[PDB]
Amino acid sequence: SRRYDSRTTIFSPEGRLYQVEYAMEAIGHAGTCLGILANDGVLLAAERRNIHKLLDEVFFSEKIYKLNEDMACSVAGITSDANVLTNELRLIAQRYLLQYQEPIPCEQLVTALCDIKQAYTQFGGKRPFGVSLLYIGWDKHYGFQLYQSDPSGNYGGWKATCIGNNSAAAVSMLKQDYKEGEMTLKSALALAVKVLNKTMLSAEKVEIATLTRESGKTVIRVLKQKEVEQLIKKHEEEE
């Protein structure tokens, strides 16, 4: 019984947690997910890794999920782990809204899911969740926001970020192209497309979602095939 034990939540000589570090390696071989914060909204531009000539479109999206009325997220890692994680995120948001009768703030939600991820890396003797998340939303305290989360249970707020396949190559491109404080949703979509192309595109190999505010109401919507197609053509004109 103690010989078959793999000891997942255990420290190592260097002081690192192997299991968590091995789960981070699996997130670097997943569909690239990028989020950009603007002034009138925040978007999620993830690449679709489920492409084939025999696959159905059925659902409304494949990587981008809706947590609640004003929040959304894009995962990157084990697909089945996200199904568990995103279902728990919806529960946390519903429990909070049932208690205070108000939408849960974005940072409180991300923090609650990170406490569950960190508990799997300290006790229980089970493998950690092999998934990284990107959250976009709007609350009355800080407005539009964009958070990132990894398998260790660590999180942080950003203006522009990227998780997945070419995170380091995409992050550098955003570093020298993000005009902090003077970014609009329209000009951010170009940035996404520009970075998404240089880090891999068709209008079926990607999926974009924007989150904006209209008449005291959050509006989350996935851009349509045609809607994205035009963006891709406009980036070709500048290239």
- Applying the rule CB under 8 A, the residues between 10 and 39 that interact with another protein are 10-16, 19, 22-29
To another protein, the closest distance from the beta carbon of 19 in angstroms equals 6
Shortest Å, Cβ 125 to another protein: 4
Residue 148: closest CA among 49, 197, 61, 77: 77
User: What mask, x for binding another protein by CB under 8 A, covers residues 70 to 109?
Assistant: --------xxxx-xx--x--xx--xx-xxxxxx--x-xx-
Considering only residues 135 to 154 of the shown chain, the ones binding another protein according to CB under 8 A are 140-141, 145, 147, 152-154
Nearest to 228 by CA among 211, 207, 199: 207
The Cα-based distances of 186 to 30, 43, 193, 216, 232 in angstroms read 27, 10, 11, 20, 13
CA atoms within 13 A on the CB side of 181: 0
The one among 122, 187, 225, 230 contacting another protein by CB under 8 A: 122
Query: Does residue number 215 form part of the binding site for another protein (CB under 8 A)?
Result: no
Note whether 121 binds another protein by CB under 8 A: yes
Cβ at position 236, least distance to another protein in Å: 26
From the list 210, 200, 35, the residue with the least C-alpha distance to 235 is 200
Quote the radius of gyration of the chain (alpha carbons, Å). 18
Of 126 and 234, nearer to another protein (C-beta) is 126
Considering the rule CB under 8 A, would residue 60 count as an interface residue with another protein?
yes
**CB neighbour list of residue 52: distance below 8 Å, 6 or more residues apart:** none
* Among positions 64, 73, 113, 174, the unique one binding another protein when judged by CB under 8 A: 174
Report whether 67 contacts 93 (CB < 8 A): yes
- Candidate list 41, 45, 73, 127; residue touching another protein; CB under 8 A: 127
Minimum Å gap between C-beta 35 and another protein is 11
* Distance from C-alpha of 46 to C-alpha of 84, rounded to nearest angstrom: 20
Nearer to another protein, 116 or 232 (CB): 116
Interface with another protein includes 196 (CB under 8 A)?
no
Q: How far is the CB of 231 from another protein (least distance, A)?
A: 22
Binding of another protein by 115 (CB under 8 A): yes
Residues 214 and 220: their CA atoms lie apart, in Å, by 10
CB 188 to another protein: min, Å: 13
Provide the CA 41 distance to its chain's centre, in angstroms.
15
* CA gap 174, 113 in Å, rounded: 27
